[PDB]
């Protein structure tokens, strides 16, 4: 099977060196990351794409393409075991807040790492999650990374990778051990390549939204809110100059003579309105558009900031971005072939009327065996 | 500190003659006079 | 404005003298090896009736030991026209990095001069070194180098060593080729226009970057053109216990990050090899 | 680059989407099947499914229409153990690889790697191949784009990089005006000069009147009354509103995403439909299938990826099953092959 | 037009193994020089009843 | 080269370098580029002996 011998030795020659345990995210990228979650815009797109995606619900079953009679359900008390943890993991912690910090890393630094404490028997105990920012990862010889070093000086748990760990008789791991799920880029170089975030391409529009933002709190209060810029002549004795003014003043809601014309015998006074728009101070125009390229790059229909929208947004970045990555991720390495991690999709609240639809009209067909109008809608057997 | 990989060659660089042996009347003896 | 895909570059390389050469693998940057320098005699031929023996002399047993030595250079660009060319400056260069070293390595490997360069076997000088006797013509005593040196030449080799070729410039060998007999004879070749046997029958491989005494094929010889005795014409080694020339890593290309000033991206490459001299009996030079 | 980069892995998301599997090809007319063993086929249906080590099928789609969309090519690495069993499959990064061609017409290996690497990996074409046909040991594909003067691979590469280079340095250029200009242009309004003759020491009395007027002045609201000596003020318009150049600038974002064909409306349902059966299926998903159906498994047999999948043509292949069912002079199996199920 | 490479340049040097860096080497040149293309022309008259 | 593996050890022989740094410098570090350790600063109440 395995032959072990994969063409990725084409960096560890000289382009990298093995054992340094380098980090897998760059500094800069962490600090972007970071500020964006305090960014209007960018948190709020953020936030979005971890909440839609924590409400999928998690479940065990039968793969589809089960051409593997051999079922790599090894024991069928693992899978159970398995089950119990997609559904509660390590105690203080639901399956629901994994989702959400999974894809909400992956978001921001296109990667997911887990912990997995497997008891002795491929019985796995608890899931943990992993800090992309401060998780270091060092390589082999050939291809491939094979233990990942979390923490500086006092946690230096020297955590094996999948590939290279204390197998059972079947294939499945006795020891802990992570994943490190990896987004791919150009050029391949499947782990020593650079991230694949939408984070990359939005640094001019967030630094334009700042700047603009930055001279409309400015602008708002630093502007003379004031009207009526009235100017005397050179020969008015201050003194009357005064009663002028007390005149003119003295006409706001709730005065002496409020209302009332204001008459001035000789020195004709000249009195100009200022404008003050102050209606355009954030650049209304060169603001929604870099809004919009802050949304549209992480995958969002304007709209959502109707119904055919949200549809949309589900079928076409959600779904194919988040859910099909984390589920190839697990089903690759949490259980054997013929079983593997699945997600309802008639959980999601805006597709119900769709799949209805959709489960109504193919009833009327009558060319089609009844297994195979299930299985083109969910419903395995 | 620095270990030399040893390597398995062996120059001998020596010379022997042929034999003139062969050609030779072979005959064997048992005493030490004949 | 018409710009074509020709590429004529007309620049030429060696022969190669390594496929002769006894290889060697080595991972370590220093490797050892043993030597015998002779076994002694040990027993003589005794008188009868002595209740002795003598205890003879023993032989010597060296351990000898030699490093590998590194190869490296540099060359940078400005990134500026790399971005607008119709080409690659970079897949030119690297094999304008390698096509350095393959004859730098050979050469060196030859005539490499003790520190910091295998010692090749030429500048060794100590490959027994034969020379061939002069000629007189109309008084004069020119030197010179008849057909008849060259077959006592490789003849004269010591059996028991094994087969050896020759090496030697192909001038060397088109001035062979192309000798007369008293009246009007070629010695080899008689009446064909062309004398070309299958050279790996007479074992005799070719190269061009030897010394070549007939300097630019012009110095035959009959009055100022003599081959200027002391020059090097052909050698003879079992090359494969003669020298050995060991690889420990093929050569290497490194971007620099740090150096490269934002306008010249600078490469970095480099190779670590070397070779070393075995038993310099088997082996005879030729020479004028 | 922004909108370039959201076009790239929009393209690179959609075609990993869909799921693999090997099947009987329709056109099935080669009965001698090259379904050589009948566990090649069930070993390939598990590898496409998963692939080599810490990389699935999904990874290995979206790499594969990412490396085509940018350079017109796609190449991949096998291992096949003894007998036609693949053993895993590798991409290999493009911008580093390099091949040698024979001397008739065609390439013969590839080399991967400048120095240390020197794997001259074998092309599919010369390699060691079974009894039946089949190779037994590694290889490469090198997919490649077609292009006008033929030349199949010593043409120049064909994507639609080609084409975008004058708008995205427009695009760049003009956002740079914007990012510059958003910085540097005064924020402040009414410039308030006085005249020669006001005496220091009042005339600041001027600045600070007008100043305490402010939201946190005292005067706020209230009026300036200046007795003598007109000060004049003058409000700067700082429009502000153009520094991208809105009009200048949706028209690069259209073109250099109308090359890469998608609908603008993307960046409506009939929109989605049409990207994903005009450019996504007959430019990713036809070369992509019909590149592996050619060499990975004999003939009769080649890998297919299922339409229903596509969640935007469930819809449509919903009503297009349910008015051929009304239809009656069509035998039941032609029914099923004109919209999928095989038998 | 077309390419004339010249002589490409000595680039290693074999240096000492103690420092970090390497030595600078000549370059080479490339020399994309042109050429021209020459016409061939002439003409010759007939009659028509002389040729029928 | 050299089997003994170096660079172990002087990312042991930093740490430690480091660890009794940290120790002797809360304790008489003084102002500028140290933290100011208790020891010198010295308004901890003080009580001595008498011969």
């Not at chain 1, 989702?99 to 992956?106: E, M, P, Q, T, V």
């Not at chain 1, 015998?265 to 309105?273: C, M, P, R, S």
């Not at chain 3, 490469?267 to 030729?286: K, P, S, W």
Request: glycine letters at 8%; a negative charge.
């Amino acid at each position: 099977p395995a032959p072990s011998a994969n063409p990725a030795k084409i960096f560890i020659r000289r382009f990298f060196s093995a054992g340094v345990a380098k980090n897998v995210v760059s500094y800069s990228n962490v600090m972007a990351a970071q500020r964006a979650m305090e960014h209007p815009v960018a948190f709020r797109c953020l936030d979005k794409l971890g909440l839609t995606v924590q409400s999928v619900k998690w479940d065990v079953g039968k793969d589809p393409q089960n051409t593997q009679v051999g079922d790599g359900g090894m024991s069928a008390s693992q899978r159970k075991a398995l089950q119990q943890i997609l559904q509660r993991p390590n105690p203080t912690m639901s399956g629901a807040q994994l989702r959400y910090s999974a894809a909400l890393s992956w978001a921001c630094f296109g990667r997911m790492a887990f912990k997995v404490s497997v008891m002795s028997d491929g019985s796995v105990n608890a899931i943990w999650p992993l800090g992309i920012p401060f998780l270091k990862q060092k390589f082999d010889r050939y291809g491939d990374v094979e233990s990942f070093q979390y923490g500086d000086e006092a946690g230096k748990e020297t955590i094996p990778s999948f590939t290279k760990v204390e197998k059972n008789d079947k294939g499945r791991p006795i020891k802990n051990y992570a994943f490190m799920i990896v987004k791919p880029s150009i050029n391949g170089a499947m782990n020593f390549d650079v991230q694949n975030t939408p984070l990359q391409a939005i640094g001019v529009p967030v630094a334009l939204y700042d700047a603009l933002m930055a001279r409309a709190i400015d602008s708002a209060d630093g502007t003379p809110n004031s009207k009526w810029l009235v100017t005397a002549s050179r020969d008015l004795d201050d003194g009357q100059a005064k009663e002028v003014k007390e005149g003119i003043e003295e006409t706001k809601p709730g005065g002496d003579n409020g209302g009332e014309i204001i008459f001035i015998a000789g020195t004709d006074v000249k009195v100009q309105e200022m404008k003050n728009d102050l209606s355009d101070i954030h650049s209304k125009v060169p603001l929604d558009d870099q809004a919009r390229t802050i949304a549209g790059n992480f995958g969002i229909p304007i709209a959502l900031l109707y119904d055919e929208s949200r549809k949309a947004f589900f079928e076409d970045t959600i779904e194919p971005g988040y859910l099909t990555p984390l589920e190839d991720g697990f089903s690759m390495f949490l259980c054997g072939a013929g079983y593997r991690v699945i997600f309802d999709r008639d959980s999601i609240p805006a597709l119900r009327k769709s799949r209805a639809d959709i489960a109504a009209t193919y009833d009327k067909v009558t060319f089609i065996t009844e297994e195979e109008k299930r299985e083109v809608t969910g419903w395995p057997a | 500190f620095f270990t030399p990989q040893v390597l398995a060659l062996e120059v001998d660089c020596n010379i022997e003659c042929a034999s003139l042996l062969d050609l030779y009347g072979q005959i064997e003896v048992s005493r030490s006079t004949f | 404005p018409q710009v074509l895909a020709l590429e004529v570059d007309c620049n030429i390389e060696c022969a190669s003298l390594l496929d002769l050469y006894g290889q060697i693998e080595v991972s370590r940057s220093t490797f050892t090896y043993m030597k015998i320098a002779d076994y002694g005699q040990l027993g003589e031929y005794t008188c009868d009736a002595k209740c002795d023996a003598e205890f003879g002399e023993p032989g010597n047993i060296r351990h000898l030991e030699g490093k590998t030595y590194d190869y490296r250079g540099v060359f940078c660009f400005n990134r500026k026209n790399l971005q607008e060319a119709n080409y690659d400056f970079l897949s030119f260069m690297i094999g304008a990095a390698q096509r350095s070293h393959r004859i730098n390595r050979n050469q060196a490997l030859m005539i490499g001069k003790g520190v910091n360069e295998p010692k090749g076997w030429l500048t060794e000088n100590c490959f027994p070194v034969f020379q061939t006797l002069p000629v007189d013509v109309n008084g004069t005593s020119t030197p010179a180098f008849l057909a008849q040196d060259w077959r006592r030449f490789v003849t004269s080799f010591p059996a028991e060593y094994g087969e050896a070729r020759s090496v030697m410039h192909q001038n060397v060998f088109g001035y062979l080729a192309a000798m007369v007999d008293a009246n009007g004879r070629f010695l080899f070749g008689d009446g064909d226009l062309t004398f070309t046997p299958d050279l790996v029958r007479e074992r005799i491989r070719i190269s061009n970057c030897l010394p070549d005494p007939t300097e630019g094929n012009t110095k035959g010889g009959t009055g100022q053109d003599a081959f200027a005795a002391g020059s090097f014409v052909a050698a003879q080694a079992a090359w494969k216990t003669a020298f050995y020339a060991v690889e420990k890593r093929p050569m290497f290309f490194e971007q620099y990050e740090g150096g490269s000033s934002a306008w010249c991206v600078k490469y970095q490459f480099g190779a670590e090899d070397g070779g070393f001299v075995g038993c310099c009996e088997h082996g005879r030079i030729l020479q004028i």
